[PDB]
Design an enzyme around this catalytic site. Structure first.
Site, short mmCIF file in Angstrom:
data_model
loop_
_atom_site.label_atom_id
_atom_site.label_comp_id
_atom_site.label_asym_id
_atom_site.label_seq_id
_atom_site.Cartn_x
_atom_site.Cartn_y
_atom_site.Cartn_z
N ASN A 74 -7.95 -8.41 6.01
CA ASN A 74 -7.09 -7.23 6.12
C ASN A 74 -5.63 -7.63 6.10
O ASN A 74 -5.13 -8.23 7.07
CB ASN A 74 -7.39 -6.48 7.42
CG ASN A 74 -6.58 -5.21 7.55
OD1 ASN A 74 -6.64 -4.34 6.69
ND2 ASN A 74 -5.82 -5.10 8.64
N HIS A 78 2.76 -3.61 5.80
CA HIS A 78 4.11 -3.60 6.34
C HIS A 78 4.71 -4.99 6.24
O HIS A 78 5.68 -5.21 5.51
CB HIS A 78 4.08 -3.14 7.80
CG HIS A 78 5.43 -2.77 8.34
ND1 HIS A 78 5.62 -2.38 9.65
CD2 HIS A 78 6.65 -2.73 7.75
CE1 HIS A 78 6.90 -2.12 9.84
NE2 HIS A 78 7.55 -2.32 8.71
N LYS A 79 4.14 -5.94 6.98
CA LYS A 79 4.65 -7.30 6.97
C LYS A 79 4.88 -7.85 5.58
O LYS A 79 5.82 -8.60 5.36
CB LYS A 79 3.72 -8.22 7.75
CG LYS A 79 3.83 -8.03 9.24
CD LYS A 79 2.65 -8.64 9.97
CE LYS A 79 2.78 -8.45 11.47
NZ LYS A 79 4.00 -9.12 12.01
N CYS A 99 2.93 -20.29 3.99
CA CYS A 99 1.99 -19.93 5.05
C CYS A 99 1.21 -21.19 5.42
O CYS A 99 1.79 -22.27 5.53
CB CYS A 99 1.04 -18.85 4.56
SG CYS A 99 0.52 -19.09 2.87
#
Lengths: 151, 151
Positions: A74, A78-79, A99
């Site tokens: 998921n 927004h982020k 990341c």
């Protein structure tokens, strides 16, 4: 000898992407003349890394995105958008997007960037897959196919 | 919608790499503002491709490299160096390096570029593999490990 960070690659003119960097990557990273870094993980930035940031005066934007496995994934719309904003600001370049493994999270952000750049999903996905490789997940790409690019 | 050429990617600031482009790729290629192209195949450039070149004032440099299969492969040290020359000349940027699938021939040239840029073979190879993928050949990488970078 220089050692680009894990899965390192140049996205566009002032944008870069890769996995989580470590000491072995600083010298190379020092080459890019990074002005800021878009970190996409909720874990706290390690000590050595932070040191490098201050020493080099690189802004650190962080949009923590929980990292789950394919079965149930998921992506925070927004982020991603928040990061897409920073990324889109020329002032922030040179930027390094990263990341954990520089595959999914980083891959989603760059994917939406491409969508904005009017690339066809076919081409967008292909680039995405080039980095995720065996770990390329459908969820991420689905997230891209549905990304509402309306600024 | 835009459609980057096969295995397209931005190598460095003004350098690009990809496989043999076609009509569906021009629109996108027009975005790059290519000043020249480094073609690495001996086959003659198709008609449509040529038309695009002239229409866009793009200088075509061609260093034909016979394309063989793994069992017995052999990269022309000379032709690669010549291409590396053109590549190193800022005047020529933006440059698009390309061969047939943009994997081996294109991969070697970019490989030697990295060697120049002081990347460790480990990192150099990793990038090479990222594009060749299942068709990544040892020969090529060997050709890189043994490339005399003495300008």
């Amino acid at each position: 000898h220089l050692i680009p960070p894990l899965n390192f690659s140049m996205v566009d003119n002032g944008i870069f992407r890769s996995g989580f960097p470590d000491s072995a990557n600083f010298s190379f990273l020092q080459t890019l003349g990074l002005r800021s870094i878009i970190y996409l993980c909720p874990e706290p930035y390690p000590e050595s890394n932070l040191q490098f940031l201050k020493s080099n005066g690189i802004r650190l934007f962080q949009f923590g995105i929980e990292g789950n496995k394919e079965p149930f994934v998921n992506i925070p719309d927004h982020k991603i958008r928040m990061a897409l904003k920073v990324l889109l600001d020329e002032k922030n370049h040179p930027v390094l997007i990263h990341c954990k493994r520089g595959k999914h999270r980083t891959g989603c952000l760059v994917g939406c960037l491409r969508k904005l750049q009017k690339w066809c999903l076919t081409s967008i996905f292909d680039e995405y897959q080039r980095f995720a490789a065996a770990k390329a997940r459908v969820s991420d790409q689905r997230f891209m196919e549905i990304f509402d690019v309306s600024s």
